[PDB]
Nucleic acid binder design. Sequence first.
RNA 1: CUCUCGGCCGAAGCGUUUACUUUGAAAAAAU
RNA 2: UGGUGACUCUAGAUAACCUCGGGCCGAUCGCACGCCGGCGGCGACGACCCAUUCGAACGUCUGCCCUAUCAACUUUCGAUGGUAGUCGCCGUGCCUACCAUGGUGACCACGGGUGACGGGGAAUCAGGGUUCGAUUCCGGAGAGGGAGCCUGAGAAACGGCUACCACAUCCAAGGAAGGCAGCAGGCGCGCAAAUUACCCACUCCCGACCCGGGGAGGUAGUGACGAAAAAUAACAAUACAGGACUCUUUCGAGGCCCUGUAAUUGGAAUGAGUCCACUUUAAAUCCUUUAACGAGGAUCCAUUGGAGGGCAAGUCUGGUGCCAGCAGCCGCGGUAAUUCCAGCUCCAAUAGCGUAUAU
RNA 3: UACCUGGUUGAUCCUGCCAGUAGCAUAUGCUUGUCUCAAAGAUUAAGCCAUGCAUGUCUAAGUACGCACGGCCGGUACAGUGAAACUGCGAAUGGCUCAUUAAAUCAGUUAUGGUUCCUUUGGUCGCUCGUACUUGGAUAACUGUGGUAAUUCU
Lengths: 180, 124, 262
Amino acid sequence: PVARSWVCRKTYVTPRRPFEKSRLDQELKLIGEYGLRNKREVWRVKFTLAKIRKAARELLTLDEKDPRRLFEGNALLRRLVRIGVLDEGKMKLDYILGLKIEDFLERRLQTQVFKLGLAKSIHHARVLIRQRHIRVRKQVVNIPSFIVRLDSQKHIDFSLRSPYGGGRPGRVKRKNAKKG
Amino acid sequence: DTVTIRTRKFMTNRLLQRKQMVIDVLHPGKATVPKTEIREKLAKMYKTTPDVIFVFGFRTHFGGGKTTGFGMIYDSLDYAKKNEPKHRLARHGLYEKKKTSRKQRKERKNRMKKVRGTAKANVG
Amino acid sequence: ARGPKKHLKRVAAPKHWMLDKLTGVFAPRPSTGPHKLRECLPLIIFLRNRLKYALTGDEVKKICMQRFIKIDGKVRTDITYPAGFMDVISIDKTGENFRLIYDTKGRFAVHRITPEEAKYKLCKVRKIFVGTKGIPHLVTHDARTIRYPDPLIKVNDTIQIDLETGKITDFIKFDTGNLCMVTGGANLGRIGVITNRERHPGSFDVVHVKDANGNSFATRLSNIFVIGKGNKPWISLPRGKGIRLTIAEERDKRLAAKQSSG
RNA sequence: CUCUCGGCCGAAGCGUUUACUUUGAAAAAAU
RNA sequence: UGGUGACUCUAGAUAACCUCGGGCCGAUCGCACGCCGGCGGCGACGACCCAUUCGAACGUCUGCCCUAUCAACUUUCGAUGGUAGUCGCCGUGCCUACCAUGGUGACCACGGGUGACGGGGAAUCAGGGUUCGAUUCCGGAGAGGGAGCCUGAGAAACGGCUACCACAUCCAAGGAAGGCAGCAGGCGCGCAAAUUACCCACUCCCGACCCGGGGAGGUAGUGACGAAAAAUAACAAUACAGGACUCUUUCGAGGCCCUGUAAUUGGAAUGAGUCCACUUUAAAUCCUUUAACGAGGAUCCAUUGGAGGGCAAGUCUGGUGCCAGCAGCCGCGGUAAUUCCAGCUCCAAUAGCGUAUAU
RNA sequence: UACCUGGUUGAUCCUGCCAGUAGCAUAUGCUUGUCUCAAAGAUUAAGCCAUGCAUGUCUAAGUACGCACGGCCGGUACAGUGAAACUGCGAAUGGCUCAUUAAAUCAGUUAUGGUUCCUUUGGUCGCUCGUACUUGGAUAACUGUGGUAAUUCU
């Protein structure tokens, strides 16, 4: 016996059919639209939405005045409004099933650097975040797979230790100045 | 210069004769500040001497904005020599550990276990 | 096992202690005493895990050996000492007084007392017998056997014991209409007036209890404990008054308090 | 559903009994 | 008297007994010392009994995989019950004596097998289900196999003893000493599994105990079991090829976009790494934090499988020519082989990806 | 995500298996830069085990005539620190393993009005009508003499 915790999920599910052009083409468009690394990063969001929809399936089977549906459903409807997926006018549990994969990947940090005009490419943004140039209010975030909350969006900036924000230059601009 | 200390969870044990608290550090440019520099910052915040304030358990976040640690301020050094774990007295030179390893004496313990009453002191 | 077990795993701990998984293997194994280990806080969990007066399991040693902790007015030094329900924990250097009243959710709370109220307690009787030349004897839940009680005092009644002398002062009898707190099972920690006691010979008796907002429920008999005479409690009462909230109104209570706390 | 005691109701007799259904308590923590 | 749903309960009374291998009824220590020649306050060890706590132990009801090529089983040596006892801590064929002739069984007894320790649980799933659970929590069991004990409150204890059986150690030959299914580590076995490391600082336990000890446990090492995050490039200007929006009968033009080939240019940003110091910690290491150094393509160079179909992706080139081989299946291979052996290309997953096997 | 696809024929529609497909575990082959957790001699051999360690313990408060120290002040029975040894306690928890075991174990559920219980918490402890201003003998530790090749032997 030790003092360790052995719990861990798996965060993706490999699909049933390995090779079909309708699926390989439809995953690879989303990789190219959103700068993802491999197919696992598509198979991850698709797996989290496979759980959000499956939990909302069993709530729709219950009685409409069942208190378990009223409490647990109003939490799930709350947790999607805060990450900017559903909306205030559409906060009913029927609409959770009307969600798509790229509804979620609009809220990855890799895409929200690009949509805000900080990066000049969707690929240039995955650079910057891993290059530690991006901060969320005070915190250098080093992961593109970072679901920006709806209040956590309107201030995302250039990480004051960076050459872009606070302006101490890196290795390259120092060595070029060591010649002239 | 631009290093700043605040204390979040302040508490006064009368039953350990100390002032138990949690330390915020703002070191935005530098490395993690050493223990002795934070004691000089702290002992003049709370008007004691740095002789008696003991800090430990510091941890810097991802990005170097802050470091959070623990700190306790005794009322007298005689109490601090009583109510402190004895590795944090060695960190101020107030304690010395003997230099025998565990395999040293546990060999010796089983050797002297074989001897009757007189010569158990002879085995070393 | 060939004898009594002296160890307790943190996984096998009772949940109301609120130990966590990751800070070690073993739990602090309450000593034999006036309470059951499924029922008690040891002093160490109360002292460092609740009050945060100590950090490790050795700074608790450096408080108990310095004799600052009185439990029902008696200086106790054991750290694995089972302090149970309706039990006055007092510390004189700080000048603080604590009683282990179960909170709403079934856990021992940090309940501060007037030092006047710190001089007594309440105790449910457990059995009443006559031993050795006609001397009547009580047994409380603390195993305080008190000889020569009032003859009116019967089993399942609650007595106010002065802690100094160790002698009874007055009592409430188990009757429909008195105030009670559940001390076991699903409804643990909840507080309400007794409505009814249905009886079952050869088996367990169910008491139907009704809260201060009409929320009626039931227990067994042996999990109930009388508090007061009717609606008035003879002791002080924690800030959650003993009324269990449903989760939606518990959530809704937080969501307005976070708005007012701006 | 019934005749008495106690403050018309409560307590008491049982209504031929069970299954079923619904409720309530009891059901270790970890998962 | 007092209690139970219910006593042959508790309490009372009387007569007696009370084991010498005996039952309590104190010949014990520490500290503050102060009061009417004389008294006392805190404690610490005690202790018959009673309750309490920790339990333990015997029971109650219901629930277990496969098997009929196991259909009757138990009773002469207790099988089912009765009475009296012995023994037990207590209830009882637990055991003895004497009686009775029972007890279980297709509603599957009994016997046999299990690659069976049982649960909490795990994998897989539409719903139903199927399969696993040696393994950190709970209960059980055993310390080579049996058996028998001493001590104690608690043991049929094995880091206690005594034997036997089987192994095996030292020796002067007389004797003596064992038990890793504890942590390490070794041999053997195998398809299949790690360091003779450091520490009691945490978590807790034990002891006369704030102070000692703990291979419990923690900390490092080995670690592609498995799980989480996540680099191997980004941008700009030209060389064109493009190709969309615009003007233009077309031609052509565009400053409006996008894509590629650039061993083309261009400085910008970096971690991997080397390494002060701080932090970490029992002391370290790792991570985090920060100096200094550290990026232009044969380097800081991504590999595993495949390209007939199923099944995504060549009718390319060269060799071999029922050979060598491929191929889970169908099939390919006998001079243009889309299937072998190689080169080029491209496609699937990607720090992973093939194969065998159980499911 | 409530799913199929190839294969008997000259060709078709079936029965149907075989093979493909996804997971999950164990082994394995090749490859491997970073970082966070983390399984790990179960399967077969409940086979055999070099060496080391894993169980000990003192408060003010059971017993101190070891100068083993220093130390009053020296006639104060005994100042102190205190090894050893007697005593008391613990060693029956923990750790490991899964061989035996098929109404056995175990789980839920009940009982002890049918038992035992160190410890802790509480009660009780001039309730017995019959040298005490303190009893007796001994053994360790210590000193000394020894045995055996051999040990925690004596």
